[PDB]
């Protein structure tokens, strides 16, 4: 991924502002409420039945904290995209066999709550420098099917 | 396919827009020129500066137009059948590039309407911009 | 959406389908798991050898479903609630795997149908079994 | 893209049957009537107002011609497809910015156009091999894009 220096301040800046413990699970979450088929590949989650349930689910936002720190470990390494993400990859690719399409979901509903958190500082210049971020990862995901 | 409750929240949460529809619109717009670049193809001839008048001017007419959806949303086709034309007929817009409007717009009121914009919210107001989007993708005459 | 002329153009080439409905539903789900490995995953139990009967059964399946959405091509959502609820709420199938399986009943279609199977036809086809694909991988309960 | 023995042979068994001015015309006139959006990629090349227009213009039918050559190019390099469609995704993807889908649209509208020919030639196990082909063709072309 090529950001400027502006671009990558910027995203670096509001990054330092994300809940480590919460916002995965809400990006994980909302993946699972707004994307409904998402759900079949979390079976062992338990309790998915409504959104309450999903977002309440202690084992979603578990999880979203690893999501999240994926997408951390993309942001300290942008040049290194693939090589960070080839074990993700295998896994989400060749053993999971999820859709690539999904990745970009999941992308566009942490840029979501990242506004919604937010509000007018998420201005749409940071939001074209998280899109950049949320294309090289998805890409970096779906590396194997490349 | 939107179901009851969908229609529901979408009618309760696109209502908060009121007198912002242009000025929510025109964000929208251009977070999507400035995010994905490639659809200002389909603007040859418009000023696509940031604050632009005639940005702000469009962005009316988008909101509007979803204002006209919510208010015939069990009946679309009939009620956008002049934007279908438009858009696919004239325009021959990507249907890609409806995907990149409505996740714009989703950020635009993910970021103005905080209280509003619930899991369940979101999902109902992405089914009903995707419905918007393929009925305005759709040739149907 | 499907134009007027779409529905019409779907009802007279799935009626040439006929009596063959059930082998074609049969020979597109092969096709679909031959060329598309990963969509049996969604059937972990299945004979899913070359000639299985099971898979013969449940490509009858399919094709009736499809012969009942053509009798109610203008009100597919509640022709197919039953169906959409088992595919989109118990099943959760992946919308690609819908875009899959209509590519290969076109590919089925054309195989055995080649006068039948104009440009025409075959997009008026394609919007029809997208439009089902919609129904099937929505939640409107 | 590595096939067996078997599928090599019975891919190149079918494509020598293709008729090489036809095929690619009728492959690229689908494409512009199933997807109409395409068409906005050749508004020089006159009437496309009708299937029948679509199907009979010569522009149509001589560009199809190159993109069926494309196929059969990479036929011989299944092995090198990112290599050897590198000119044609630096054009379709940084210069004509034709979203990557389509390319797929493309590959499947080719499938079924060889259905169409080449009926009970065109078997379960054949398609699965064609598959794999133009996956590989539409990957290749949207390398810039990866
Ligand atoms: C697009 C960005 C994504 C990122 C950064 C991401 C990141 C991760 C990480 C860090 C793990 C844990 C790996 C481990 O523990 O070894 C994981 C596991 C997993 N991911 Fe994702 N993921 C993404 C998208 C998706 C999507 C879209 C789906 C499904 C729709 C998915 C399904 C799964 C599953 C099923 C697991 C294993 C859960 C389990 O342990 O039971 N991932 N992912
Ligand atoms: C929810 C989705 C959309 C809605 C509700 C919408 C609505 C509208 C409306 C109301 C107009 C003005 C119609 C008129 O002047 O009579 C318009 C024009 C237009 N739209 Fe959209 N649109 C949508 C998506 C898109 C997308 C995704 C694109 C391309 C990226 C696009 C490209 C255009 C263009 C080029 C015009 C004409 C501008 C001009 O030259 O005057 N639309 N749209
Ligand atoms: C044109 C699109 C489709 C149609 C018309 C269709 C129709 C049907 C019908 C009629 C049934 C039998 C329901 C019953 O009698 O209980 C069924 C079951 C099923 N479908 Fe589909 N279907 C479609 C697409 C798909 C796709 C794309 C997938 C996955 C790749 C899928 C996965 C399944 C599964 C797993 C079952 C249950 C099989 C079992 O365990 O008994 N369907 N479908
Ligand atoms: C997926 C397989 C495809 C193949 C193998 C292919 C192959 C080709 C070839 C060989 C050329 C000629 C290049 C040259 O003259 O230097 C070309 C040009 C072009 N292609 Fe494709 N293409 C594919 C998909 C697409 C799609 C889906 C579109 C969408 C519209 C597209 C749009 C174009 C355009 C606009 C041109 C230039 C036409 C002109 O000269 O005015 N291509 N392609």
Not at chain 1, 93 to 101: F, I, R
Not at chain 2, 88 to 95: F, N, W
């Given at each position: 991924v090529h950001l400027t220096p502006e671009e990558k301040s910027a995203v670096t800046a509001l990054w330092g502002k994300v809940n480590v413990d919460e916002v995965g699970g809400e990006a994980l979450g909302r993946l699972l409420v707004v994307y409904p088929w998402t759900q079949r590949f979390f079976e062992?989650?338990?309790?998915?039945?409504?959104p309450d349930a999903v977002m309440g689910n202690p084992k979603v936002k578990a999880h979203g904290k690893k999501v999240l720190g994926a997408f951390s470990d993309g942001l300290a390494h942008l040049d290194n995209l693939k090589g960070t993400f080839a074990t993700l990859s295998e896994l989400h690719?060749?053993?999971?066999?999820?859709?690539?399409?999904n990745f970009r979901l999941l992308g566009n509903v942490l840029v979501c709550v990242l506004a919604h958190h937010f509000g007018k500082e998420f201005t749409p210049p940071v939001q074209a420098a998280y899109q950049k971020v949320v294309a090289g990862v998805a890409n970096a995901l779906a590396h194997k099917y490349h | 396919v939107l179901s009851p409750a969908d229609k529901t929240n979408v009618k309760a949460a696109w209502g908060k827009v009121g007198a912002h529809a242009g000025e929510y619109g025109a964000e929208a717009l251009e977070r999507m020129f400035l995010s994905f670049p490639t659809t200002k193809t389909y603007f040859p001839?418009?000023?696509?500066?940031?604050?632009?008048a005639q940005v702000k001017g469009h962005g009316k007419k988008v909101a509007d137009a979803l204002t006209n959806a919510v208010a015939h949303v069990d009946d679309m086709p009939n009620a956008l059948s002049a934007l279908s034309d438009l858009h696919?007929?004239?325009?021959?817009?990507?249907?890609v590039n409806f995907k990149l409007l409505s996740h714009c717009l989703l950020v635009t009121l993910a970021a103005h309407l905080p209280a509003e914009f619930t899991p369940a919210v979101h999902a109902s107001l992405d089914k009903f911009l995707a419905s918007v989007s393929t009925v305005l993708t759709s040739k149907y005459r």
């Open positions: 062992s989650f338990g309790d998915l039945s409504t690719c060749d053993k999971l066999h999820v859709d690539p399409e | 001839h418009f000023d696509l500066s940031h604050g632009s696919a007929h004239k325009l021959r817009v990507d249907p």
